[PDB]
Write a protein that binds this ligand. Structure first.
Ligand SMILES: [Mg+2]
Ligand SMILES: [Zn+2]
Lengths: 87, 171, 344, 143, 101, 303, 98, 263, 297, 137
RNA sequence: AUAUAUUUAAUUUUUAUAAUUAAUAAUAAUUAAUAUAAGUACGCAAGGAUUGAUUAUUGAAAAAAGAAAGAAGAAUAUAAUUUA
């Protein structure tokens, strides 16, 4: 088959949970913006591995993670977005 | 001349144990640098009469370089023109397997005894493995791939055609 | 390939929006326990998460708005339906040929190829067979060289009667995937193969009878030795093992040839679909008249054989058009030559 | 432990030498030869061994930059009619260099033309004696 | 329940030793159906340290696998091996008496 | 790499080790009438036993407003089932609370939720008015109790919107979306909750584990094996004292601590007890217990 | 096998419709011992055969071992006879005679 | 690989070179793989579906073939959205600096997600930037009043030290003139030291001070609330002076050079 | 049909460069459409033009963040796109240049990253856009030179007498839609802009956020950098005596201007002036980079 | 008879009996008069990013008994003329050819004047697999 | 520098049909140099990069059911090349 520029130029493989947006303007690397501002190419290899046992706890909205009210029902904390066991 | 695949890995292995360091692409020299006889020397002994006293000192200089060229040639495994001297037939052969019996190098003898054991280890583990690997169709194909003897006269004596044509067109 | 531990299949490693099962309808949140007592003390039952909601919503919006930019991301849903040819799952049955003769050809660059021509007299899909109906355990038997009834043995003529297919001389089975079936009695035209195609062939080489250990293994038969016994590398102590018996696999004199030999990955040279002939640049060892079997090579050099860059196969099997008549068509018109290739 | 070298499988042991009759194999050979002729890789020839034996021939091997030309004497023709088999035995001498080639017909990068179907057995014998003397001299200088 | 203990308990009912009329010649017993072998438990470090070795006809063919390897291959193989051991503890002379149970 | 350092499956502890570790940690098998381990292996106290321990320890120095709140919490389902007799117990609890500690947001919100379950919206309104008169401004919990009582009694959507808007105006409830969507979210939460009689809500599910001892004693609540769901009483008291001495570090969750919590570098080695089983320790004997007079009768469910 | 394919896969109602064919094929499948294919290959009862139940990976007893002859048909018939317990009214047993 | 071989290259190379033992379903496995779905784990209970657990170890499946008709389940539907409500779109790009709140702001934003009681024209941000806030940034902050009690310290050694060091860092914070925005008040008879923060809008926030809370903890709390308040201002329409290179940034690069020369 | 046409317009981007007809028509003229930070906006403006076909011959999306398209002191390349007019069938070759900048990268990038890590404001970039209109000899298609000269005297710009009116109006429409009609100019306007920049350089300059240093440079463009960039733009516009202009302005130029002069000489294609500049400039990082620019032995 | 040989010889009929018992549950549905093929849940989570930040794609393929019967009974359609005429390519063209020459730059040795659309040597060497989004060749 | 036992290499003669099970990781430690990678980072200069694809050895591996005293050729390679 004929050549393809998409096959020519590679693309970064970042997981969806870590993507800031699915826009084609941000589907590239994050270091690219700083390299463009600094007018220099960067070739830092293997910047970071995840872990030998990667674990992350659940994260919630910016306002919710600090303005959560202490609303409780019979035995369960009840927020407008989450449930949990209470004692 | 690109070196053999198995022989190259043998130099990478022996270099790591000797220098305690990863091999350098400029030191291992995966391309054999073979040197031809100087153009002046072939025409030197040509116009020199046999009665000339200076012919022996330049003839001995060529006989030594004629053997050194063999020593560098055996380290290659790429297809190369090799003619025999018995029936004078020109054919394409690999220099390592063809010039193995003439060069008489112990490391080339020890690798031959090492590869025979390596084949016995695979064949003794699985007897049926010999059926597919070593067959008359496979054996005849490998002999044509490594022509250790002329297909016409069946003689092991051979010569580098490149050195021969270099000697003829100058002499 | 790339190692991927199953424990690394969490939503923080998924490339697309991770969708939980959640019964009948896929959801973006783990299934909240219906019994409230099953709630673990630190388990945070999530019903609505604005982060995941916004990410999934933007993803769906972009996918539905820009199909050209997000065409490759469409494989996340609406997968290719079953029945169409697949690049990594669809394997088709081969054919049964007869080694006809040998000749020599030349390519345009100047290389000479000593080729052999095989003949495919009458390839017909005879039978289908699966064992107890498991996965990938189904195969198609193809028969060849139609014969009269007085030729075959009674117990094989009985099978051909039971099948109803015209009685064939030989019948070889090819293991295939269920989406590559062909109805019983389907004629297989030689154009089923392509000229620029790699094929794996299986045959029986010629018989030499009982031959000496020298003639069998060449120079290898003269020296046969293997010692797994322990030996002292340094003179510090004394200890070794005696090689009592002879290890199995010892190279000796015996039967030579008359075995099932298989060549893997030989390219086709030319195809004649009027006399049903295929040319291969590899000289075989078998005699003339040995029923060889041709099958498709799976992959070479980590690259699948059937892909868009090289070409699409005649899946499931090549069927000629109606208005084509091989009788009216001449022999020179029925010639397909492979593109040039150099091997030196 | 144990392995088997022979296979009595029916599909492997069955043969088709009886059914080879319905295949026009000689017609396939002639069709291949005619295709080669029409493409121009070879040119049809109808001579006998004694007629062609001893006739001068010129062969040009195409090669960038300069195709190599060689004028020799036909020593042996393997086939009397055109076919995919073919075969010609030429003998050519340069300045202090003899060579005996086996030219196969049908090679596109090789154009060999015999200057005349007629041949002189006297010149054939002369070339044969020259070649044998050269071969004997080479062997004697080798050994 | 641990592997050796459950194997001994199963073999005592397989070989028919729990019957008061048990005779060494007459091989009679009860059919024991073992369930949830995938959830069998051995104490720590044993799944890694306990070796299972055997010999094949080829030279140097001393196969040595871990309990973890045999479990990831087939969990029933471990129970069958321990049953074979518990049976051969008493019946190893006769192929009948060591295979039939 | 392929050789695993740790192994979550297969298990590394037989059945007897469950009982051994249960008796080692210091826990006691209480009868079903007192409490039991539910389906989530959490310890659950019967409302009857809760009221009994309330009646017995309401006078001791360690009793607290939070203990009264938890007692009312445990009585809540019994109050929902029978609002006639259990409201008397709730009123007794409130009387003792007024005697000892007095007016408090905790006790007022608890009795408001109790009335909401007992289907007394006039009583809920009276309690809210009493809070406002005493000067305890209605909290987010109070407004959610208002909404729950409205939804349970059958008060309309606008009647509940009145209380939600009042909470928004007061500022006890912080909203980050439109008021309509926020009220929709709160109503969907309360609808998924349901009541102990409405067959749709979670509270309708009355299935219980009914086991005096949890099935898996080595059950993990967090990430590593050191974060066990069941621990010894010494370590539990350590956690209790740390919860009060270091209550400041609980406010912030920083990525430093998040990535430090990953147990990929923590040691996982087999201790001597991992081979010898949990250390044998005596169980709490109950020889002094009177003989069961109703041993033949079958005990009923909690609520 | 053809009868199984015809009465199970492509026409699953003929047996439930006609009880006579059900009993006839059942008595035929009982008359020909199908569930013990070793008696197909044994020649003397003193030494029973294992041509069907035995198989080794070296290549012995490949086409003849583990033949699914009437297993699917027998399963369909027993399932038809158990349909009554889930249907609460016997269709086949009401159509057939004592 | 015997039997049926699929065209997929190297699909069974991690399992060895054999297609044997495929009927098995329970293998050795770590957390998150195999039969651990019955067991409970905090991370995996929310990061994996209990039906998504497959083979563990080298037996990880790169090619799975099953029989039966495929039941493609429908995709999840976005909840809390009005039917026919046309949302505003926000085009994100690397040209906009990542530190700007518009990057973390919602991309697909409806009108039903916009708070009207606050007075904003757009919905608020959802994800907050993660940063170990070591210093204060009083640019988006109007003033701060730290009321502390100097009477006795044997009662609040931890609390008094924390509040005093927080005041010190607030004085040394990143600001053109933080001495004009920071205020300290001695209360001779006070219950517990308080910190009132008033933003440009005038909203009053109180970071709770408890035992064990450090000055860095208070700084992180105040800076997180400051970012939230700045998002609120930008959503309401108030313009804010953006962060740029300042003399405080140079004084910080001083110690940056110091530590990079150290190690 | 709509999806097929849209994917054809998309594959117009995937088309290669060699087989794209560039030098198909004899006459050609270049124009400078201004400087933009994100040239993709101007590219979208050009794409959505009624006087051009929606299916180009060769399209290349410009992304300043991909490692192969980051503007470096040593130019990574020039993005090229091609469009075809509808009614006159004239070619438009849009060039997005990235080698115009003359700034040198910082010595310690970690310090620069620490400085511009938390900054909530990023300075604009000056990235040029050029357009080469290509057309065959037309006598009546252009409508005579009088109409084009009237258009020139009306809109202050300059055009060829044989240029297609369709392409001219398409260019004017794109520029007026993008709002950079003031920045749009030819060689006549580029000379005036260069004179204005020379006057600005003679005048004192105001202070920026922070003075640029060898360790930490200032991404904000200086008057000298703008002068060098505009010299490069004039060279791209192929001024007839650009060599003479560079030879005249060499002595009064700084190093940021001399770097642009060297790049302009390399664009022009004469080796003598480039060697003279690289030999006359004192040894420095700028000299090493300008030697690294061109391939040598 | 080795240990594994005896184990398999005694377990293989039991494995077949277990598979028969499993298919009996499927036959339960067709017995009640409602012939329903087995349904499998389609998994949308098959595109992952590994620890080393590279793309992995799992392949899950299902078999339809109705489609199998259709392919058994009905003959396949006519093969395409171009498909059977155009021969298959012998050499696999690289993902990114390095042309080394472009006519656009005036001075070809000028490394900064070459257009960006031409792939680089690094891509020519490293790009041997398809891109992250596109899975097939 | 004696015909033996164990162990090996084969064979038990068309069997229509391979191997879900003994070869318990791997036929090279899933390679791998090489022109082109680069007259290029790094080096005052001299000189000198990491690196993986087309050129190679890379498919790793056992074909066990039918009626048996000619030569398994009616023999000069045709399953009768006309045949009295
Ligand atoms: Mg036989
Ligand atoms: Zn010879």
């Amino acid at each position: 088959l004929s050549v393809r520029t998409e096959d020519f130029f590679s693309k970064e493989a970042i997981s969806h949970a870590r993507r800031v947006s699915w826009a084609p303007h941000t589907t590239e690397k994050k270091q690219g913006a700083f390299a463009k501002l600094a007018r220099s190419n960067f070739g830092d290899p293997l910047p970071s591995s995840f872990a030998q046992e990667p674990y992350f706890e659940e994260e919630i909205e910016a306002h919710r993670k600090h303005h959560r009210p202490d609303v409780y029902i019979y035995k369960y904390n009840v927020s407008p977005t989450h449930f949990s066991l209470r004692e | 001349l690109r070196k053999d695949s198995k022989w190259l890995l043998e130099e990478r292995r022996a270099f790591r144990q000797s220098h305690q360091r990863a091999p350098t692409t400029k030191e291992v020299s995966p391309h054999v640098d073979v040197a031809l006889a100087p153009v002046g020397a072939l025409k030197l002994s040509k116009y020199l009469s046999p009665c000339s006293a200076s012919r022996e000192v330049v003839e001995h200089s060529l006989l030594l370089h004629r053997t050194v060229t063999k020593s560098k040639l055996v380290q290659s495994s790429e297809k190369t023109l090799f003619r025999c001297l018995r029936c004078f037939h020109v054919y394409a052969a690999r220099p390592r397997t063809l010039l193995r019996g003439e060069v008489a190098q112990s490391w080339l003898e020890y690798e031959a005894e090492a590869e025979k054991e390596e084949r016995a280890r695979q064949l003794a583990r699985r007897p049926h493995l010999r059926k597919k690997k070593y067959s008359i169709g496979r054996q005849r194909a490998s002999l044509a791939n490594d022509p250790r003897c002329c297909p016409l006269c069946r003689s092991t004596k051979a010569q580098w055609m490149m050195e021969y044509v270099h000697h003829h067109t100058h002499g | 390939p790339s190692l991927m531990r199953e424990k690394d299949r969490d939503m923080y490693h998924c490339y697309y929006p991770y969708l939980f099962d959640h019964g009948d309808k896929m959801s973006l949140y783990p299934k909240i326990p219906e019994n409230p007592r099953e709630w673990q003390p630190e388990q945070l039952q999530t019903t609505y998460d604005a982060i995941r909601e916004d990410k999934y919503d933007a993803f769906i919006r972009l996918r539905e708005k820009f199909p050209e930019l997000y065409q490759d991301t469409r494989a996340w849903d609406n997968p290719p339906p079953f029945g169409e040819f697949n690049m990594f799952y669809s394997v088709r049955f081969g054919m049964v040929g007869v080694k006809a003769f040998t000749c020599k050809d030349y390519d345009e660059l100047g290389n000479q190829f000593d080729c052999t021509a095989f003949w495919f007299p009458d390839n017909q899909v005879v039978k289908h067979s699966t064992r107890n109906g498991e996965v990938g355990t189904d195969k198609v038997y193809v028969g060849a060289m139609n014969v009269p009834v007085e030729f075959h043995k009674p117990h094989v003529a009985a099978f051909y009667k039971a099948a109803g297919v015209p009685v064939k001389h030989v019948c070889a089975g090819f293991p295939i995937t269920p989406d590559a079936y062909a109805p019983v009695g389907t004629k297989l035209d030689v154009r089923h193969f392509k000229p620029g195609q790699e094929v794996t062939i299986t045959f029986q080489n010629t018989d030499y009878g009982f031959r000496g250990v020298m003639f069998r293994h060449g120079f290898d038969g003269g020296y046969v030795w293997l010692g797994d016994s322990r030996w002292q590398r340094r003179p510090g102590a004394m200890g070794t093992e005696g090689q009592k018996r002879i290890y199995p696999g010892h190279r000796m004199a015996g039967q030579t040839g008359a075995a099932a030999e298989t060549y893997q990955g030989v390219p086709v040279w030319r195809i004649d679909y009027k006399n049903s002939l295929i040319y291969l640049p590899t000289l075989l060892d078998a005699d003339v008249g040995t029923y060889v079997r041709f099958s498709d090579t799976i992959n070479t050099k980590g690259l699948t054989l059937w892909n868009e860059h090289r070409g699409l196969p005649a899946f499931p099997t090549f069927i000629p058009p109606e208005d084509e008549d091989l009788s009216k068509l001449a022999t020179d018109e029925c010639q397909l030559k492979s593109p040039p290739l150099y091997m030196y | 432990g144990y392995t088997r070298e022979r296979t009595n499988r029916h599909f492997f042991v069955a043969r088709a030498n009886a059914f080879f009759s319905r295949l026009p194999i000689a017609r396939v050979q002639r069709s291949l030869a005619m295709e080669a002729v029409r493409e121009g890789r070879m040119r049809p020839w109808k001579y006998t061994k004694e007629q062609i034996l001893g006739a001068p021939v010129t062969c040009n091997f195409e090669y960038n930059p300069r195709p190599v030309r060689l004028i020799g004497t036909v020593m042996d023709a393997h086939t009397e009619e055109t076919s995919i088999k073919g075969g010609l035995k030429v003998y050519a001498r340069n300045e202090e260099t003899n060579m005996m080639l086996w030219i196969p017909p049908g090679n596109p990068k090789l154009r060999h033309e015999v200057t005349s179907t007629k041949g002189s057995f006297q010149h054939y014998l002369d070339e044969r004696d020259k070649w044998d003397e050269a071969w004997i001299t080479g062997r004697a200088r080798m050994k | 329940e641990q592997l050796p203990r459950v194997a001994a308990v199963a073999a005592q009912y397989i070989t028919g030793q729990h019957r008061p009329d048990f005779t060494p010649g007459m091989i009679t017993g009860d059919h024991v159906v073992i369930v949830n072998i995938k959830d069998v438990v051995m104490v720590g470090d044993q799944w890694i340290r306990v070796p299972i070795t055997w010999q094949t006809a080829y030279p140097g063919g001393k196969y040595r696998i871990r309990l973890t390897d045999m479990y990831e291959r087939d969990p029933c193989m471990l129970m069958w091996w321990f049953l074979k051991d518990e049976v051969n503890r008493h019946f190893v002379r006769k192929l009948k008496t060591r295979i039939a149970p | 790499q392929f050789v695993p350092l740790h192994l979550a499956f297969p298990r590394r502890h037989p059945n007897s080790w469950q009982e051994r570790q249960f008796h080692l940690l210091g826990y006691v098998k209480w009868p079903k009438e007192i409490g039991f381990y539910n389906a989530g292996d959490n310890f659950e106290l019967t409302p009857q036993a809760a009221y009994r321990i309330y009646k017995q320890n309401c006078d001791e120095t360690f009793w607290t407003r939070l203990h009264n709140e938890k007692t009312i919490i445990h009585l809540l389902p019994l109050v929902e089932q029978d609002p006639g007799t259990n409201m008397v117990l709730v009123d007794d609890i409130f009387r003792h609370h007024l005697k000892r500690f007095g007016a408090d947001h905790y006790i007022y919100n608890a009795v408001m939720q109790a009335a909401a379950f007992a289907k007394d919206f006039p009583r809920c309104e009276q309690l809210l008015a009493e809070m406002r008169g005493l000067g305890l401004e209605p909290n987010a919990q109070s407004y959610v109790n208002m909404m729950l009582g409205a939804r349970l009694t059958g008060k309309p959507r606008d009647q509940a919107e009145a209380f939600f808007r009042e909470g928004i105006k007061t500022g006890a409830i912080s909203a980050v979306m439109r008021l309509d969507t926020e009220f929709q979210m709160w109503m969907n939460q309360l609808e998924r909750l349901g009541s102990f009689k409405a067959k749709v809500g979670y509270l309708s599910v009355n299935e219980e584990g009914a086991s005096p001892m949890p099935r898996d004693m080595w059950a993990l609540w967090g990430w590593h094996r050191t974060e066990a769901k069941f621990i010894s009483r010494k370590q539990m008291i350590s956690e209790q004292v740390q919860n009060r001495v270091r209550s400041g570090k609980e406010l912030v969750g920083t990525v430093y601590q998040k990535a430090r919590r990953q147990p990929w570098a923590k040691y996982n080695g087999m201790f001597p007890y991992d081979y010898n089983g949990p250390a044998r320790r005596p169980a709490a004997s109950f020889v002094d217990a009177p003989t069961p007079t109703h041993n033949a009768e079958v005990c009923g469910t909690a609520y | 096998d053809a009868t199984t394919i015809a009465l199970v896969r492509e026409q699953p109602w003929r047996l439930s419709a006609s009880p006579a064919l059900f009993i006839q094929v059942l008595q035929f499948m009982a008359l020909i011992k199908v569930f013990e294919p070793n008696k197909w290959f044994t020649f003397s009862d003193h030494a029973p055969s294992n041509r069907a139940d035995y198989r080794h990976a070296i290549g012995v007893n490949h086409s003849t071992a583990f033949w699914g002859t009437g297993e699917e048909l027998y399963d369909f018939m027993v399932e038809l006879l158990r349909v009554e317990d889930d249907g609460r009214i016997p269709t086949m047993l009401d159509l057939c005679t004592r | 690989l015997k039997g049926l071989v699929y065209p997929l290259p190297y699909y069974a190379m991690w399992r060895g070179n054999h297609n044997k033992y495929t009927y098995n379903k329970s293998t050795v496995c770590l957390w998150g793989e195999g039969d651990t779905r019955s067991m409970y784990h905090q991370h995996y209970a929310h990061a994996k579906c209990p039906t998504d657990y497959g083979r563990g170890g080298r037996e990880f499946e790169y090619l799975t073939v099953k029989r039966g008709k495929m039941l493609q389940k429908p995709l999840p539907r976005v909840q809390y959205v009005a039917e026919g409500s046309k949302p505003v779109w926000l085009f994100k790009s690397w040209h906009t600096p990542l530190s700007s709140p518009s990057m973390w702001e919602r991309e697909v934003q409806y009108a039903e997600h916009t708070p009207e009681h606050i007075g904003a024209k757009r919905p608020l941000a959802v994800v907050a930037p993660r940063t170990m806030h070591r210093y204060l940034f009083l640019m988006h902050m109007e003033k701060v009043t730290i009321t502390v009690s100097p009477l006795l310290f044997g009662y609040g050694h931890t609390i008094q030290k924390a509040v005093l060091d927080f005041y010190r860092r607030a004085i040394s914070a990143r600001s053109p003139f933080p001495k004009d925005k920071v205020f300290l008040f001695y209360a001779i008879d006070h219950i517990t030291p308080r910190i009132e923060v008033t933003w440009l809008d005038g909203t009053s926030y109180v970071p709770p001070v408890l035992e064990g809370a450090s000055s860095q903890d208070l700084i992180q709390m105040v800076m997180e609330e400051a970012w939230l308040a700045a998002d609120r201002m930008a959503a309401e329409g108030r313009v804010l002076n953006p962060l740029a290179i300042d003399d405080y940034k140079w004084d910080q690069l001083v110690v940056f050079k110091k530590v990079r020369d150290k190690e | 049909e709509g999806d097929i046409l849209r994917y054809m317009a998309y594959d117009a981007r995937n088309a290669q460069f060699a087989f794209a007809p560039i030098r198909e028509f004899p006459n050609q003229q270049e124009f400078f459409l201004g400087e933009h930070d994100d040239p993709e906006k101007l590219m979208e403006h050009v794409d959505l033009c009624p006087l051009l076909f929606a299916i180009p011959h060769m399209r290349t999306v410009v992304d300043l963040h991909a490692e192969h398209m980051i503007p470096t002191i040593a130019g990574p390349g020039v993005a090229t796109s091609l469009y075809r007019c509808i009614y006159s069938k004239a070619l438009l070759f849009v060039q997005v240049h990235l080698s115009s900048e003359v700034k040198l990268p910082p010595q310690d990038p970690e310090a620069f990253k620490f400085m511009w890590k938390d900054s909530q404001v990023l300075p604009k970039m000056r990235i040029p856009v050029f357009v080469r209109v290509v057309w065959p000899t037309n006598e009546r298609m252009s409508g005579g030179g009088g109409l084009l000269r009237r258009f020139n005297r009306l809109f202050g710009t300059e055009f060829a007498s044989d240029i297609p009116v369709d392409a001219a109006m398409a260019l004017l429409y794109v520029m007026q839609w993008s709002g950079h009609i003031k920045d749009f100019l030819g060689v006549r306007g580029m000379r005036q802009r260069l004179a204005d920049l020379l006057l600005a350089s003679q005048q004192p300059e105001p202070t920026k956020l922070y003075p640029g240093t060898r360790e930490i440079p200032n991404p904000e463009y200086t008057v000298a950098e703008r002068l060098g960039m505009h010299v490069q733009y004039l060279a791209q516009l192929h001024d007839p005596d650009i060599s003479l202009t560079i030879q005249r302005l060499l002595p009064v130029a700084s190093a940021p201007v001399r770097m642009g002069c060297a790049k302009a000489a390399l664009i022009a294609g004469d080796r003598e002036l480039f060697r003279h500049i690289v030999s006359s400039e004192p040894p420095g990082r700028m000299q090493t980079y300008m030697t690294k620019l061109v391939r040598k032995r | 008879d080795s240990f594994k040989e005896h184990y398999h010889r005694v377990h293989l009929p039991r494995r077949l009996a277990l598979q028969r018992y499993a298919r009996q549950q499927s036959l339960r549905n067709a017995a009640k008069g409602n012939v329903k093929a087995e349904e499998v849940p389609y998994k949308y989570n098959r595109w992952w990013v590994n620890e080393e930040h590279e793309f992995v794609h799992q392949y899950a393929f299902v078999e339809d008994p109705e489609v199998t019967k259709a392919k058994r009974e009905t003959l396949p359609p006519v093969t395409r003329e171009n498909i059977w005429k155009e021969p298959q390519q012998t050499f696999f063209l690289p993902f990114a050819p390095y042309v080394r020459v472009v006519d656009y730059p005036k001075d070809p040795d000028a490394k900064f004047l070459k257009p960006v659309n031409i792939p680089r040597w690094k891509d020519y060497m490293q790009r041997t697999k398809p891109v992250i989004p596109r899975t097939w060749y």
